[PDB]
Amino acid sequence: EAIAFDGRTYMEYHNAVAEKALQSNHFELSIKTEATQGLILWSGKGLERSDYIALAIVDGFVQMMYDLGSKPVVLRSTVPINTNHWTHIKAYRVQREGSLQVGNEAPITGSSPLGATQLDTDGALWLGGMERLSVAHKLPKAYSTGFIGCIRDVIVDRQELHLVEDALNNPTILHC
């Protein structure tokens, strides 16, 4: 079941099986797009003070960004994502270290600054864009740009995410 996004489509989900302290994050999914800029996924409370970890298309390539409390670190892929062809994306973080693998490229890795190791969230996860966009002039434009393309087989922390009935904001479902 592939879902389509037209640039104004954003779905809200909450972590499946309070204030939680997460030591790790695991994201898998496939996407299809022609976009050079766009927010794919944002996990965090979404507030100015909140920690986060996100996936986005910045200037033609997928990149992973996260701030656990000691400033953000970015991991940028070397694969052009706007081929309009389905492409797999494997992303994970264990404490400070992270890995981003788009397609069959060699995994790009890195560590966020010394300090925080936990992502403090309430379980919120956004797809295609995010409600609280207080970042239009605080991060690259891609992060406040709705995604345009398709997404399928999304797996979060080893658990399959059901794009349609798991959504909470009763969105307008359009398939690819």
Ligand SMILES: [Ca+2]
């Ligand atoms: Ca933290």
